[PDB]
Write a protein that holds these residues in place. Sequence first.
Motif, PDB file in Angstrom:
ATOM      1  N   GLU A   7     -14.377   0.379   4.205  1.00  0.00           N
ATOM      2  CA  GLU A   7     -13.763  -0.385   5.285  1.00  0.00           C
ATOM      3  C   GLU A   7     -12.646  -1.324   4.853  1.00  0.00           C
ATOM      4  O   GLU A   7     -11.569  -1.342   5.442  1.00  0.00           O
ATOM      5  CB  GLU A   7     -14.823  -1.138   6.132  1.00  0.00           C
ATOM      6  CG  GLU A   7     -15.997  -0.250   6.629  1.00  0.00           C
ATOM      7  CD  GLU A   7     -15.542   1.144   7.023  1.00  0.00           C
ATOM      8  OE1 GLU A   7     -15.922   2.116   6.315  1.00  0.00           O
ATOM      9  OE2 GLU A   7     -14.713   1.297   7.951  1.00  0.00           O
ATOM     10  N   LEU A   8     -12.834  -2.065   3.743  1.00  0.00           N
ATOM     11  CA  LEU A   8     -11.817  -2.914   3.135  1.00  0.00           C
ATOM     12  C   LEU A   8     -10.586  -2.138   2.675  1.00  0.00           C
ATOM     13  O   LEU A   8      -9.453  -2.603   2.746  1.00  0.00           O
ATOM     14  CB  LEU A   8     -12.464  -3.703   1.966  1.00  0.00           C
ATOM     15  CG  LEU A   8     -11.596  -4.801   1.311  1.00  0.00           C
ATOM     16  CD1 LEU A   8     -12.477  -5.979   0.867  1.00  0.00           C
ATOM     17  CD2 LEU A   8     -10.792  -4.289   0.103  1.00  0.00           C
ATOM     18  N   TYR A  67      -5.411   1.683   3.575  1.00  0.00           N
ATOM     19  CA  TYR A  67      -4.753   2.146   2.370  1.00  0.00           C
ATOM     20  C   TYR A  67      -5.132   3.559   1.951  1.00  0.00           C
ATOM     21  O   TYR A  67      -4.288   4.341   1.527  1.00  0.00           O
ATOM     22  CB  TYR A  67      -5.052   1.172   1.199  1.00  0.00           C
ATOM     23  CG  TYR A  67      -4.692  -0.234   1.599  1.00  0.00           C
ATOM     24  CD1 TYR A  67      -3.345  -0.615   1.715  1.00  0.00           C
ATOM     25  CD2 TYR A  67      -5.694  -1.168   1.912  1.00  0.00           C
ATOM     26  CE1 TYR A  67      -3.005  -1.907   2.141  1.00  0.00           C
ATOM     27  CE2 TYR A  67      -5.357  -2.459   2.342  1.00  0.00           C
ATOM     28  CZ  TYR A  67      -4.012  -2.827   2.456  1.00  0.00           C
ATOM     29  OH  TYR A  67      -3.682  -4.122   2.894  1.00  0.00           O
ATOM     30  N   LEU A  68      -6.429   3.917   2.037  1.00  0.00           N
ATOM     31  CA  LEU A  68      -6.916   5.202   1.550  1.00  0.00           C
ATOM     32  C   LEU A  68      -7.091   6.208   2.681  1.00  0.00           C
ATOM     33  O   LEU A  68      -7.285   7.397   2.436  1.00  0.00           O
ATOM     34  CB  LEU A  68      -8.288   5.019   0.839  1.00  0.00           C
ATOM     35  CG  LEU A  68      -8.216   4.635  -0.660  1.00  0.00           C
ATOM     36  CD1 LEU A  68      -7.411   3.358  -0.947  1.00  0.00           C
ATOM     37  CD2 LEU A  68      -9.637   4.496  -1.230  1.00  0.00           C
ATOM     38  N   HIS A  69      -7.009   5.765   3.947  1.00  0.00           N
ATOM     39  CA  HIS A  69      -7.106   6.630   5.107  1.00  0.00           C
ATOM     40  C   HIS A  69      -6.152   6.132   6.168  1.00  0.00           C
ATOM     41  O   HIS A  69      -6.014   6.756   7.221  1.00  0.00           O
ATOM     42  CB  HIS A  69      -8.539   6.656   5.706  1.00  0.00           C
ATOM     43  CG  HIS A  69      -9.538   7.411   4.881  1.00  0.00           C
ATOM     44  ND1 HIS A  69     -10.881   7.066   4.931  1.00  0.00           N
ATOM     45  CD2 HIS A  69      -9.375   8.556   4.168  1.00  0.00           C
ATOM     46  CE1 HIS A  69     -11.497   8.004   4.239  1.00  0.00           C
ATOM     47  NE2 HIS A  69     -10.634   8.927   3.754  1.00  0.00           N
TER      48      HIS A  69
END
Length: 27
Positions: A20-21, A25-27
């Motif tokens: 979630e954090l 950035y990653l999704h």
Amino acid sequence: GIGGKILSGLKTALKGAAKELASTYLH
């Protein structure tokens, strides 16, 4: 039963909260 104590910290930190954090950035 110990896995439901330890992994509920360790996996939750690794790829719950740090999904979630990191989510924008990653999704």
